[PDB]
């Protein structure tokens, strides 16, 4: 064991180290504080401890763990709240009587006091086994298995002992593998380092559609299962409704919410709001909490859980994606991780970079976005999995030209910006073609257009009218309404209702939170049909104010058809949107004559 | 579309029939003069360099 | 969006051109404002 020579701030120096490394985590002091050896100077190694140094005496023993900081992979991840450092937050409420552990909290990462239902998979005695194969399953979902028991990576052999169906503990072993002699005993919990990526057979292109729960987001530029999305904006852009809509209205088998720099109130509101919401796929009691995994942090929490929150969430998302289920990762935000890396770079005494941020934010940000994505699941079964990483960003320097927003936005393939002018009107998010871009919308429109889509023309026409609405509003604001024609006024009138109804996606009730493709395609088709009918009635003889004031509640009923849940019509297309086309077609004939 | 249901099995017939004679002369030519390069490599390995 | 090094040189010439255009528009608005009432009195008589 080493001896602590000096402790100044969040960094501690311990001499007599012969087992220290650059990414290995160890425990310093008698309280078992969470820390890791970042660098070494001669015979002593400098260890940066994210925990509070108030109450740690100089001269205590330091024992290195001999491996990097990782998390436990097994049954018990869903329905439990933990931190980014792989610590149990549920045990702190019983033992310490607090939400977060302030200091001196030595608890296990995996729960070993509860029993789970262990059932056998598609393997038996005498069959070959490999790393990533489905060795078992646990009933922890609505109608399917959630926590699938898989073997560790970089291992193989034959299953000598297979446990039967029943309840067992995490500390008890029910699996035995024989490969070149007695290899080791297998249990429910497994170890995996968070500083190394999860193994896989091969990576594939993302070609599956994903529901984000937003009419303007899915209508403007929808994402795929396995893509990277960046969301800039000062003071957020509606990450609560977008995060809850991605878990509730999302079509993924697993949902992972990770908070690296949250205050704690939004994570408690989103965590408590998950048990009240019912699953729409024939779920059970606590359906959203059983298939959701939450990693809660604090503003004054440890830097090891904040920086390791994206690594543990990406490792848990890769472990859930390795079994064959679709996982969605909602991270908020990367600016707290970049500021935590800049605080570690400034406190450690390393050379800084431009814009006050460290030089490892580009490689760590590119490795964090590169660690997620869609690919083939590792193992003998060869299942299909996907990991959608959605990380929002904020302006740390006060502008959109910083290295944090440009570094995360440059490596990402999908973008969803936020306009301050549209955000000031109580509409979040607000971007049509100036802050939003996506390359998978062409392949993503093939399936939604394959079912019953009209979004392929209405998305380009709505993006063209939304992009031309700012250019018409600039000349209309600068010069006035005297140098513009009636077509630009009708296009600005349709862009005002399309921006008011499409940009507003906050929701004032339970029916204003889900946004299907049929409702957005019907509203965009009705707005495009009203915009084409206004141009045809203006070309056949008519006025713009007589067309908009002549329409009135015909467009007001289409704008007001977002405060009810879809339970009428065929499956999701109510008759109010179907009769709006006949009412607009009947009003278009009377508007001409 | 009929050329894709029979071409997926002809990849091994075309790859085995494409390179089938060079694999015998490539292994025969290496095993023929293997002692001449093995003696030069053994003589050069026994000297300090 | 915008540049991060040496970007004030375009804003200085844009502000000077906006000030010169505002001065010329103020002079033309003053001349038209005088000629409007100057014709309005004789039209009123």
């Amino acid at each position: 064991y080493g001896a602590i020579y000096s402790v100044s701030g969040p960094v501690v120096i311990a001499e007599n180290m012969i087992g220290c490394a650059m990414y290995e985590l160890v425990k310093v002091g008698h309280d078992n504080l969470v820390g890791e050896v970042i660098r070494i100077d001669g015979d002593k190694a400098t260890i940066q401890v994210y925990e509070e140094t108030a109450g740690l005496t100089v001269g205590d023993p330091v024992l290195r763990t001999g491996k990097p900081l990782s998390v436990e992979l097994g049954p018990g991840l869903m329905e439990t709240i933990y931190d980014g450092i792989q610590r149990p937050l549920k045990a702190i409420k019983e033992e310490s009587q607090s939400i977060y552990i302030p200091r001196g909290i030595d608890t296990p990462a995996l729960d070993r006091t509860i029993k789970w239902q262990f059932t056998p998979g598609k393997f038996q005695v005498g069959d070959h086994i490999s790393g990533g194969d489905i060795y078992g399953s646990v009933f922890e979902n609505s109608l399917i298995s959630s926590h699938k028991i898989l073997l560790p990576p970089r291992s193989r052999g034959t299953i000598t002992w297979i446990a039967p169906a029943g309840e067992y503990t995490l500390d008890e072993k029910i699996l035995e593998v024989e490969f070149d002699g007695k290899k080791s005993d297998f249990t429910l919990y497994h170890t995996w380092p968070v500083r190394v990526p999860r193994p896989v057979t091969e990576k594939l292109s993302a070609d599956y559609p994903l529901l984000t729960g937003q009419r303007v987001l899915d209508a403007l530029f929808p994402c795929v299962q396995g893509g990277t999305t960046c969301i800039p904006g000062a003071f957020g852009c509606g990450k609560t409704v977008i995060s809850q809509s991605l878990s509730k209205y999302s079509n993924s088998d697993a949902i992972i919410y990770v908070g690296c720099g949250e205050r704690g109130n939004e994570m408690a509101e989103v965590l408590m709001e998950f048990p009240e919401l019912y699953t729409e796929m024939s779920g059970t009691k606590e359906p959203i909490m059983k298939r959701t995994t939450l990693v809660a942090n604090t503003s004054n929490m440890p830097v090891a859980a904040r920086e390791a929150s994206i690594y543990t969430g990406i490792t848990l998302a890769e472990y859930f994606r390795d079994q064959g289920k679709n996982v969605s990762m909602i991270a908020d935000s990367s600016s707290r991780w970049a500021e935590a890396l800049r605080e570690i770079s400034g406190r450690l005494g390393e050379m800084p970079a431009d814009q006050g941020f460290p030089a490892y934010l580009g490689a760590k940000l590119a490795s964090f976005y590169e660690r997620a994505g869609k690919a083939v699941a590792l193992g003998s079964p060869d299942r299909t999995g996907s990991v959608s990483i959605v990380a929002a960003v904020s302006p740390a320097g006060g502008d959109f030209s910083d290295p944090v927003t440009t570094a995360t936005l440059g490596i990402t393939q999908v973008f969803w910006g936020l306009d301050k002018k549209l955000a000031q009107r109580k509409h979040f998010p607000s971007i049509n073609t100036s802050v939003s871009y996506s390359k998978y919308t062409n392949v993503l429109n093939k399936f939604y257009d394959s079912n019953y889509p009209e979004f392929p023309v209405l998305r380009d026409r709505m993006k063209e009218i939304l992009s031309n609405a700012e250019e018409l509003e600039q000349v209309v604001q600068l010069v006035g309404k005297s140098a513009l024609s009636d077509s630009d006024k009708i296009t600005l009138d349709v862009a005002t209702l399309i921006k008011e109804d499409f940009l507003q996606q906050n929701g004032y009730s339970t029916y204003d939170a889900f946004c299907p493709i049929w409702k957005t395609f019907d509203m965009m088709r009705a707005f495009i049909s009203y915009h084409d009918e206004a141009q045809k009635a203006v070309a056949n003889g008519a006025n713009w104010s007589k067309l908009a004031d002549s329409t009135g509640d015909v467009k007001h009923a289409v704008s007001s058809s977002k405060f009810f849940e879809p339970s009428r019509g065929e499956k999701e297309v109510h008759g109010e949107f179907e009769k709006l086309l006949s009412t607009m077609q009947e009003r278009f004939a009377e508007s001409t004559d | 579309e009929q050329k894709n249901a029979g071409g997926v099995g002809e990849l091994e017939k075309k790859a085995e029939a494409g390179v089938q004679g060079e694999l015998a002369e490539i292994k025969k030519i290496a095993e023929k003069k293997k002692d001449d390069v093995v003696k030069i490599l053994i003589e050069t390995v026994i000297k300090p360099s | 969006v915008f540049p991060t090094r040496m970007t004030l040189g375009l804003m200085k010439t844009k502000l000077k051109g906006a000030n010169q255009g505002y001065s010329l528009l103020k002079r033309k608005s003053e001349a038209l404002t005088k000629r409007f009432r100057d014709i309005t009195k004789r039209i009123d008589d």
Partner: protein, 165 residues
């Protein structure tokens, strides 16, 4: 317009199959050439392993390899790690290795050679010695398998250009 996309998909599938066969043929040829070069280099290590089992002719090659490994260290005390059957040959020639090393030394003569009791592996290393410093922190692979494997990287292009060129 409904037929043209399926025709382009069929042409892309035929081109993907032809590219797969055209990659499999070159992969099989590269695997054959690498198997032939690995067979010749595997036979050379078996010939050197068979020639290394002689304690009469292997003494000057082991003393010359110990002098060559000692010539690249420049330390006053050298620790030689060899096999159990090679410690007696270095023990019966440490004075001639120190005199021959001091006769062609560029810094200074060797003070003394300490024969370590730790032996090398015998599973993939047949014969040779391992030169190390006094602190046991820098090791120079002076074995026949490591010397043949290090010389195979520079002898592989000359034999490959003459055998497959």
């Amino acid at each position: 317009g409904n037929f043209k996309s399926k025709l382009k998909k069929a042409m892309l599938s035929q081109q993907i199959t032809k590219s797969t066969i055209a990659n499999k043929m070159r992969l099989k040829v590269l695997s054959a050439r690498e198997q032939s070069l690995d067979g010749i280099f595997e036979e050379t290590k078996e010939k050197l392993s068979g020639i290394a089992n002689n304690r009469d002719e292997y003494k000057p090659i082991l003393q010359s390899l110990i002098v060559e490994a000692l010539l690249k260290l420049l330390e006053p005390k050298a620790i030689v790690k060899a096999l159990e059957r090679d410690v007696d040959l270095i023990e019966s020639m440490k004075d001639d290795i120190m005199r021959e090393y001091g006769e062609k030394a560029q810094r200074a003569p060797l003070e003394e050679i300490v024969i370590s009791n730790d032996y090398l592996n015998k599973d993939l290393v047949s014969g040779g010695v391992v030169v190390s410093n006094a602190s046991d922190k820098i090791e120079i692979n002076n074995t026949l398998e490591e010397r043949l494997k290090l010389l195979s990287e520079e002898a592989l292009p000359a034999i490959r250009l003459e055998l497959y060129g």
